[PDB]
Design an enzyme around this catalytic site. Sequence first.
Site, PDB file in Angstrom:
ATOM      1  CG  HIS A  64      43.222  54.479  42.022  1.00 46.83           C
ATOM      2  ND1 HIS A  64      43.921  54.658  43.189  1.00 46.83           N
ATOM      3  CD2 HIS A  64      42.161  55.280  42.072  1.00 46.83           C
ATOM      4  CE1 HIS A  64      43.248  55.521  43.972  1.00 46.83           C
ATOM      5  NE2 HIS A  64      42.170  55.919  43.306  1.00 46.83           N
ATOM      6  CG  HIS A  94      40.357  48.541  35.268  1.00 51.55           C
ATOM      7  ND1 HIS A  94      38.984  48.526  35.352  1.00 51.55           N
ATOM      8  CD2 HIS A  94      40.824  47.675  36.197  1.00 51.55           C
ATOM      9  CE1 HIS A  94      38.619  47.677  36.310  1.00 51.55           C
ATOM     10  NE2 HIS A  94      39.747  47.156  36.867  1.00 51.55           N
ATOM     11  CG  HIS A  96      44.072  45.173  38.602  1.00 47.52           C
ATOM     12  ND1 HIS A  96      43.897  46.080  39.627  1.00 47.52           N
ATOM     13  CD2 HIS A  96      42.886  44.949  38.067  1.00 47.52           C
ATOM     14  CE1 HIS A  96      42.598  46.362  39.727  1.00 47.52           C
ATOM     15  NE2 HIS A  96      41.945  45.693  38.784  1.00 47.52           N
ATOM     16  CD  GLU A 106      42.860  43.180  41.357  1.00 42.05           C
ATOM     17  OE1 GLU A 106      41.686  43.190  40.913  1.00 42.05           O
ATOM     18  OE2 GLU A 106      43.325  43.976  42.161  1.00 42.05           O
ATOM     19  CG  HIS A 119      39.426  43.328  36.259  1.00 40.17           C
ATOM     20  ND1 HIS A 119      39.822  43.751  37.504  1.00 40.17           N
ATOM     21  CD2 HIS A 119      39.702  42.010  36.177  1.00 40.17           C
ATOM     22  CE1 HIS A 119      40.360  42.695  38.131  1.00 40.17           C
ATOM     23  NE2 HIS A 119      40.310  41.643  37.365  1.00 40.17           N
ATOM     24  CB  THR A 198      39.610  43.916  43.222  1.00 47.20           C
ATOM     25  OG1 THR A 198      39.963  44.700  42.083  1.00 47.20           O
ATOM     26  CG2 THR A 198      38.958  42.633  42.766  1.00 47.20           C
ATOM     27  CB  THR A 199      39.440  49.503  43.771  1.00 46.50           C
ATOM     28  OG1 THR A 199      38.336  49.586  42.878  1.00 46.50           O
ATOM     29  CG2 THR A 199      40.622  49.073  42.937  1.00 46.50           C
TER      30      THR A 199
HETATM   31 ZN   LIG Z   1      39.889  45.707  38.332  1.00 48.39          ZN
END
Ligand SMILES: [Zn+2]
EC number: 4.2.1.1
Length: 260
Positions: A64, A94, A96, A106, A119, A198-199
């Site tokens: 992911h 991590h 995005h 995000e 994040h 957010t996942t």
């Molecule tokens: Zn995140």
Amino acid sequence: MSHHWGYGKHNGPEHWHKDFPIAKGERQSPVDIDTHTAKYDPSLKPLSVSYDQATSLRILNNGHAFNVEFDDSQDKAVLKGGPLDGTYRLIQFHFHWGSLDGQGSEHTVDKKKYAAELHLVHWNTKYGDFGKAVQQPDGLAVLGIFLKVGSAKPGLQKVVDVLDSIKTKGKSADFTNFDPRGLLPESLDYWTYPGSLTTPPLLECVTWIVLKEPISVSSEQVLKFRKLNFNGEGEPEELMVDNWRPAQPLKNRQIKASFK
Ligand SMILES: [Zn+2]
């Protein structure tokens, strides 16, 4: 299973609610930060980020994103202060990112998307460990940092350099002696609101702290993110881009800020 969640047309954000009905809940993340409706709170204190003794371990492609994991067995890397009433230990970071520089974040600011978002995930020391913390409404504190394209970020280079070694899902590399101070901007002025992962599983256990100031990364640096793969080795190539959830409804939550 084939329709495990992800970011594709068949398994992406629009589908998550079928397995994770909280996806349509009252405290979902990310959100758009409308700067006219966010409220300056003069009572908001400065953030306290203590990362000088952080102990990084490994970097891994989990299908992911990629996560850099830390030793959270002691108070080596802590977030406190700000809107927080407790102390939170860093466990991983991590990012995005997008399929082009014009999207990937995000959170958005007055609808503006950034090229990526970092994040840093921390869990509350009242609760014993990460797995227990995510079951509590004040379990996690995530520090969100936008990436814009410009000058190179020196402190990101070790991450960029290692990504070729973890191209596919399930790959990892040793990743010691990484200093997460090198990912921070000069200012720690912020917005904050209550939200969620957010996942999947999208749990509503996060105090979000989103920094006002983006960090600058070079075009070359963010380009390397886009060479990762969602797939495992030997499987058809599915390039890891657009691994972001879009903004969710605020639903009468108040975004507070440390500035006007
Ligand atoms: Zn995140």
